Design a protein around this ligand. Structure first.
Ligand SMILES: Nc1ncnc2c1ncn2[C@@H]1O[C@H](COP(=O)(O)OP(=O)(O)O)[C@@H](O)[C@H]1O
Ligand SMILES: Nc1ncnc2c1ncn2[C@@H]1O[C@H](COP(=O)(O)OP(=O)(O)O)[C@@H](O)[C@H]1O
Ligand SMILES: Nc1ncnc2c1ncn2[C@@H]1O[C@H](COP(=O)(O)OP(=O)(O)O)[C@@H](O)[C@H]1O
Ligand SMILES: [Mg+2]
Ligand SMILES: [Mg+2]
Ligand SMILES: [Mg+2]
Lengths: 372, 370, 372
C-alpha cells in the first residue's frame, strides 16, 4: 500500500517522483543560493538560503553552490536542504511512510553511500532505502538485458557493460568529464569574441547557450574549414539584459572535448575510445552483443550530432564485419529515473530493500553487503 | 522402446533404438556463472547444461564431467543425464530400458556407480552397458576386425574376432581431441594469439574442426609451408578479428602419430594398431589387417586414412593387403551399433533388470555384463 | 678482449651491465615520455622525447609509454630509443665490440625474437648475440641445477621446472598477471577512500605506494576481520604535493590478486596452483627435488609476506608426507641478470653465440635454431 519514491540526485539536476509513474514529478536544479549583497528593506520574508527554482530566479543577488561535484556530495548541510525541499515542498510527501530509491555513480567513495544511508535513516527516517547504479537503471528503461551503457551527466561520464543480467565490474570505466566541464570550456572560449561571463549566475546563461546552440560535428576539420570560409554556421542568442551575442565554431568546439579531452588539458581519451576499451576488456564471445547495443543516456548525450559521430568513430575502431548500433531514445534525459520507476515496481525487488531493523542491527555498513 | 545413450567425454549422443540417426547430440558441459548479477528481471539460474552453456559461455565457467574417459564429477553427470532424459528427449525414464556405453580397460567402480545411479535415481526397467568399439564394428556390417576409436578423451585399439573382443590385445592411448585442442591453444601463441579462458577453448576447438588436416609426409609439408604461403588459412573470430594459420593445420594432428609433441610416453596410433594386431594369432592377422575400421570424431581429419594406410603398409609384411574403412557417418557409429544391438530379437533376454539388481547389488555388471 | 654485455629488458625496468659483475651497472625504467603541452620559452634544448630517469624526472609535463607490454615489444622505435640510451648513455660503450645477451619470457611470439635478432645485427651491429629464458638464468644465479622457478615481474609471471640443467618445456606455464595489473587494481581500489589517480604520471605514484606499503597476508579473511575491527593496520603516505593519504586494508588486497585472480575478472588460477600444476606435469620421480627447491625471482615476489603464504598454499596442495621448501634470496629483484652474467662468463657458452656470418647466411631465423 505504501508508495515507493525514486530520487535521482545528479550533479546538476534532481529528478524525483513516485515509483510506477512514467515521468519524474519534480525536476529542479541542485543549487543552494545565498545572499551576497546588503539587505536594506526591513522584513518582507527575506530568507538566508534558497533552494531550486527559487534560487535560479533570484540568482542576480545570490551566490549559487552545487552540493555535488563530480558525482560526490561535498557539502552535506546543503544536501540536507535539497532533500528536505524535494520531500516536503516538491513531492509534498512525508518521508516516514515512503521507501526511497537513490542512485549513485560507479567507483564512488564508500563514505558517500554510508552518509546517504545514515542521513536517510536518522533525519528523514524511512521504512526502507536502496542505492542503485544509474547505468543498470538505464538498461532497465531501455527494455533489454544486454548492452553497454554510456551515461554522461553533469559531473561523471561512465561506461558499464552488462551481458544477460550479469555485469563485468572490471570493464567499468569512469571519466570526470561531463556537462559542467563543457560549460566551463565554453565560458573560456567565449572570451575570444569579447564576451565575459565570470560569476556563478552567468554560468547558468552559458549553460543555456550550450543547451540551445551547441551541436556535435560529424567531421571536425571540415566543419572548422566551413566556419572559416562562410558565416553560415553562426547563430545569435539574446542575453537577459537585451544584448545579442553571435557564435560560430564555438557551437561544435565545446562538445568536441567529449571526443578530444586535451582541449581542457586532460590526458584521457575520448568517449568512443573509452567505450571501445570497455568492450575490448570484456570476454570475446559477448562483444558482438555489445556492439549492437550501445545505449546513450543522460543530458550530455543530448547534442544533436552525437549518435552519428559515436557510430562513425566506433565503426572506425571496430572490425568491418561487425554491426555497430547507437541506441538514443528521445527520453534519454530522464532514463535512469524511469529505470527506478521500473525497478521499485517489481515484485521481485521488495525483498532487496534495506529496512530500519537491518540498519539498527548492522549500522551504516550494510549498504555494501546489500547494494552492488 | 529402448533408449540408446552414448555419453562421450565431449559429446552426448542419445536417441531411440531403431532410428538411423541420433536425435539429441549436445556437448557434455556444465556452465556456472562467473560475474555479478545486477538485473532482477531475468531467469538467473545457477547451472547451464549443454547448448544453453554454449549460448552463454562468455559469462560462464565451463566444466566437463568426464576427463580422460573416466567420470570425475558425478553430480554433473547426474545433471547431464537429467537434461538428456527430460529436456532433449522429452521421455520418462521409468518406462524405457536404457543402453549405455563404456570405454574398454576402465576401472570397475565407474560401472558400479553408473548402475547405482541409473537404478536408484533415474529408475529404468532395465539397463545394459556395452563397449564402444564393438558397437562401432557392429554398425559397419562386419563381425571381425580392428577398431580405432578416437574421441574426446581416449583412443582405443580393440580387435574383435567373431563378435568377441580380444581383451589381451586391447590397447589404450591417453590422447584424443581435448589434448589436440590444448596443444593448438599452446601453439597459437607463436603467432601472437592468446587463448586462456574455457570459453576460448571452444573457439580453438571450432578452429581445429574447421581448418586442421593430416599431412601425408610431415617433413615435406613443413618444407613446403616454410617456402611459400600456399597453406595459410584464415579464420574469423566471434568478435570480428581475423587470424591466419599456416603450418599449425598439420602440426596439431601429428600428435596422433608423434605423441611426444605434448609430452606423452606412448607411441602413435599406427604403432598402437600394429601392436594390437601383432598380439593376435597368425591365422586371424590377415582378417584384422584387411578390416581396419575408424571411429569417432578425431578420425574426421581429411588426411588420416591415406596416412594410416602408408604407415601400416610400412609396418606390415609386404605380402599383406591393408584396407582401412572410414565410414562417412563415423562420428555417430557407437550409437548406430547400439541401435542395431538393442533392436535384435535375442538381445531382449540379456537386459539387466531391476529385480536381479535387487537380488545382487552393485556388482551384477561384472557377471551378466561386459 | 671483447667482454660480453648482459641486458635484461623487462616490462618495467632495464637491467644492463657487463658479464662477470655481481650487480647490474644500469637499472632504469623502460619508459619513453613525450610532451603533451606547448613550449612557450625559446632558447632551451626542448627535445621531443625523454628516455629513462629523465622521463621520470619531468613526468608531470610528459605522457609516458612502455614499449614492452606483457613481455612482448609493441613499439619498436621506442625500443630502439631504449636500447640506444642503454648502449650510448647508461653504459658508454659502442655495441660493435661487445657480444650481447638478451632475455625473453617463455611462450612468446617468434616475431619478437626474430626482430630482436634483426635489430641487434643490422642496427646496433654486434659481433654476436644470444637470447635466453629468464627463469633458467634465475636458477643459474640461485646456485642449483634442479628446482622450479617462479619469475614474476611487471608483465609476465611464469613457472619453469628445471631438472639437472634441463628446462622441462611441457611444464612451463605463463600467466599475464604481474605488477602492472596489481598497480592498476590498486589504482582502482584507491577510489573507495576518495583518492583518484588517472594520468600515467600518477600510475608511477600508485606503484611507489604499492612498493612501500603493500604486503601479503598469511590468512586473508582473518586479516580483513582485524582490519575492520581495529585501526592498527593503517599506514600513511605523502604525495609529491604534500598531501597525506592513508590505506588500511588495500595493503593486502592488492597482492591478493596474485592468489585470487578473480579480483580483476580473470578466470585463471593463482600462482600457487600454477606452481602445483607445473610440478604435477613433470615426471613422478623428480617431484621431491622440485618440491624442495622452489625458487622465487622477480620484483613482484618482493612483498614481505609472500613466502610463508606460498608455503602454506603449496603445503595444502601437496601430499602430507612431502617436504616443501621455498627459497627467496634477498637479492631476487636482480636474479636473471646475475645468472646471465654467470652464463656469459663460461667457457662452454662461447660456442653457443650466434655470430654475424651465421646471421648473414641464415637470415633472422637462426635464432629458432641456435637458441631455446
Ligand atoms: N539539449 C541539451 N544539449 C546539451 N546539453 C544538455 C541538454 N540538456 C541538458 N544538457 C546538460 O546535461 C547536464 C545534466 O544532465 P542530467 O544527467 O539530466 O543531470 P544530472 O547530471 O544532474 O543527472 C547539464 O549540465 C546540461 O548542461
Ligand atoms: N571435422 C572434424 N575434424 C577434426 N576433429 C573433429 C571434427 N569433428 C569433431 N571432431 C572432434 O571429435 C571430438 C568428439 O567426437 P565424438 O567421438 O563424436 O565425441 P566423444 O569423443 O565425446 O565420443 C571432439 O573433441 C572434436 O574435437
Ligand atoms: N618491494 C617491492 N614490493 C612490491 N612490488 C615491487 C617491489 N619492488 C619492485 N616491485 C614491482 O616489480 C616490478 C618490476 O620488477 P622487475 O621484475 O625487477 O622488473 P621487470 O618486470 O621490468 O623485469 C615493478 O612494476 C614493481 O611494481
Ligand atoms: Mg544523472
Ligand atoms: Mg565416443
Ligand atoms: Mg624481468
Amino acid at each position: 500500500e505504501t508508495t515507493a519514491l525514486v530520487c535521482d540526485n545528479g550533479s546538476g539536476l534532481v529528478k524525483a517522483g513516485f515509483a510506477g509513474d512514467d515521468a519524474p514529478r519534480a525536476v529542479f536544479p541542485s543549487i543552494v543560493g545565498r545572499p551576497r549583497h546588503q539587505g536594506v528593506m526591513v522584513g518582507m520574508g527575506q530568507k538566508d538560503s534558497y533552494v531550486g527554482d527559487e534560487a535560479q530566479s533570484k540568482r542576480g543577488i545570490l551566490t549559487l553552490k552545487y552540493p555535488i561535484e563530480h558525482g560526490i556530495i561535498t557539502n552535506w548541510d546543503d544536501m540536507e536542504k535539497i532533500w528536505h525541499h524535494t520531500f516536503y515542498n516538491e513531492l509534498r510527501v512525508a518521508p516516514e511512510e515512503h521507501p526511497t530509491l537513490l542512485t549513485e555513480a560507479p567507483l564512488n567513495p564508500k563514505a558517500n553511500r554510508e552518509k546517504m544511508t545514515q542521513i536517510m535513516f536518522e533525519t528523514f527516517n524511512v521504512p526502507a532505502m536502496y542505492v542503485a547504479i544509474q547505468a543498470v537503471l538505464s538498461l532497465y528503461a531501455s527494455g533489454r538485458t544486454t548492452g553497454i551503457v554510456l551515461d554522461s551527466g553533469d559531473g561523471v561520464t561512465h561506461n558499464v557493460p552488462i551481458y544477460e543480467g550479469y555485469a563485468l565490474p572490471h570493464a567499468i570505466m569512469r571519466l570526470d568529464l561531463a556537462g559542467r566541464d563543457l560549460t566551463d570550456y565554453l565560458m573560456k572560449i567565449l572570451t575570444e569574441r569579447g564576451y565575459s561571463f565570470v560569476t556563478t549566475a552567468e554560468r547558468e546563461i552559458v549553460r543555456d547557450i550550450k543547451e540551445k546552440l551547441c551541436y556535435v560535428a560529424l567531421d571536425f576539420e571540415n566543419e572548422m574549414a566551413t566556419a572559416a570560409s562562410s558565416s553560415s554556421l553562426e547563430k545569435s542568442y539574446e542575453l537577459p539584459d537585451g544584448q545579442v551575442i553571435t557564435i560560430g565554431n564555438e557551437r561544435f568546439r565545446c562538445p568536441e572535448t567529449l571526443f578530444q579531452p586535451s582541449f581542457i588539458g586532460m590526458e584521457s581519451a575520448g568517449i568512443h575510445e573509452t567505450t571501445y576499451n570497455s568492450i575490448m576488456k570484456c570476454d570475446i564471445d559477448i562483444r558482438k552483443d555489445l556492439y549492437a547495443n550501445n545505449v546513450m543516456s543522460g543530458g550530455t548525450t543530448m547534442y544533436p550530432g552525437i549518435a552519428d559521430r559515436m557510430q562513425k568513430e566506433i565503426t572506425a575502431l571496430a572490425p568491418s564485419t561487425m554491426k555497430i548500433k547507437i541506441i538514443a531514445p528521445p527520453e534519454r534525459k530522464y532514463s535512469v529515473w524511469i529505470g527506478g520507476s521500473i525497478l521499485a515496481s517489481l515484485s521481485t525487488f521488495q525483498q532487496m530493500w534495506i529496512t530500519k531493523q537491518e540498519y539498527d542491527e548492522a549500522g551504516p555498513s550494510i549498504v555494501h553487503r546489500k547494494c552492488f
